[PDB]
Amino acid sequence: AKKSQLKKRFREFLRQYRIGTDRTGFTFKYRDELKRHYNLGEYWIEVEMEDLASFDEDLADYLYKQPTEHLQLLEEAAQEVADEVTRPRPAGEETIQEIQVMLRSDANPANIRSLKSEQMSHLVKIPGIIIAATAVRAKATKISIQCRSCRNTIGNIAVRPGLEGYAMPRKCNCPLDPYFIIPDKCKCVDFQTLKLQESPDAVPHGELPRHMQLYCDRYLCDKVVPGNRVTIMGIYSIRGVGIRSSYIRVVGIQVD
């Protein structure tokens, strides 16, 4: 499939990107950073967007327009590269941890009032000021279900990231809907929701500022407190007749 080719291209980007000139020397930037972060205990990296464009313009162009699948492939590639760089791990740490990839770019920021409906499921960069936050709750990623009658088990079910659930099966494969989630067989991550307010100068005359709901996950939680000026990079998505609430899956924060 094309997914394997895209994953291989992302792995090649991670393993082969270098910075510097032959007059001084060359240093691999993302492989070294991945090794250092994984050894330190922080499982994340900050991948710029101009670097990916310079390596492969098509790959960067597929991240500015279909961020979901391409970001998932990039995270899997980062996990594989991090696993191969630190292959002989000490006893007890054989299992490889999952890596979270954060994005950054130097583009001119947009406005909250400029977000049209055409730019849905696209990477956006909007500034603002945080005015609210919520308690750090839990969000599941891997779940296992079990039948109530015949106690059949279907494990390792994956749940999509963001404010999206998982429709449970009806047929038992034992009445209708016999499946319940096993409590202890669930892997969870951190989870927080913020509220971004339009900048005090971009607000037009004689009008109250507008707001926008944000979503933060894993290492992005507990990074911004109310009253901070931030620049947010995230995926515009949806959570009256046909009206749907829209939020922003945050994949990068630059506190000012």
Binding site: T68, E118, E207
Partner: protein, 267 residues
């Protein structure tokens, strides 16, 4: 019914050609081509809204000027298609900055009030005035939904959605999996939505009577064209929508009424 007559294919083509000729050939008092300049200004500032004055349309085409206030939906759709064709002819590359050109009708001769709207005005292009009292935020609405089929992984074609009912899927070619149908978020097309609330003017309301109010719906370029506490002149299609809650409340079958806004002018 005017709707049936304008629904005819030959009538549709004739109206299309007449509107194209009107757009291409309409001199001013000094002979200047007004629509050339209008399209130039619209494309120069990256807009997708073209205003059309009813007076000159009546002067150059009385038949269409009579057809429009009685069938404002299909006639406006044909006008939009003709305007898009003319713009693409004038500016070949405008398909990047826009995907649909809208036509806004100005100076409609008939003017009414919110207190004198009855069932006679249903499904007709009306023109009222008032003061805005509420303005909700801009929310996304489903324009053209692309339903899929789990039995075959093939995705059905676009299905237009109206502001009066919930769209239902069609039929898959051979594997009739009507039930397992869902929506993808990367191919569906959305549009802006905003529901303002207008009321009668403070000065024009009868002393004995109390102010009335009606709801209006704004879509696409029309959003964020009004702010609460503004005097506006609203032109749109008076539309009837069922509301069972009002039925239960009053104890008698009653229907809600809304206005699908088409042109808004601030005085």
């Amino acid at each position: 019914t005017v709707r049936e007559w304008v629904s005819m294919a030959a009538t549709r083509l004739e109206i299309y050609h007449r509107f194209k000729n009107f757009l291409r050939t309409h001199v001013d008092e000094h002979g200047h081509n007004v629509f050339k300049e209008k399209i130039s200004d619209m494309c120069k500032e990256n807009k997708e809204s073209l205003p059309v004055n009813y007076e000159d349309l009546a002067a150059r085409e009385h038949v269409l000027a009579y057809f429009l206030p009685e069938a404002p939906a299909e006639m406006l759709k044909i006008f939009d298609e003709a305007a898009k064709e003319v713009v693409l002819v004038m500016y070949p590359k405008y398909d990047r900055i826009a995907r649909e050109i809208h036509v806004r009708i100005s100076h409609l001769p008939l003017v009414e009030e919110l207190r004198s709207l009855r069932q006679l005005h249903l499904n007709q292009l009306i023109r009222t005035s008032g003061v805005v009292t509420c303005c909700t935020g801009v929310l996304p609405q489903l324009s053209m939904v692309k339903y899929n089929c789990n039995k075959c992984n093939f995705i059905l074609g676009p299905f237009f959605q109206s502001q009066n009912q919930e769209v239902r899927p069609g039929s898959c070619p051979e594997c009739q999996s009507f039930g397992p149908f869902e929506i993808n978020m990367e191919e569906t097309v959305y549009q802006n939505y905003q529901r303002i609330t207008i009321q009668e003017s403070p000065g024009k309301v009868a002393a004995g009577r109390l102010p009335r109010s009606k709801d209006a719906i704004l879509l696409a370029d029309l959003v964020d064209s009004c702010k609460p506490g503004d005097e506006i002149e609203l032109t749109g299609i008076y539309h009837n929508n069922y509301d069972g809650s009002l039925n239960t409340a009053n104890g008698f079958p009653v229907f809600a009424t809304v206005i699908l806004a088409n042109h808004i002018t601030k005085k």
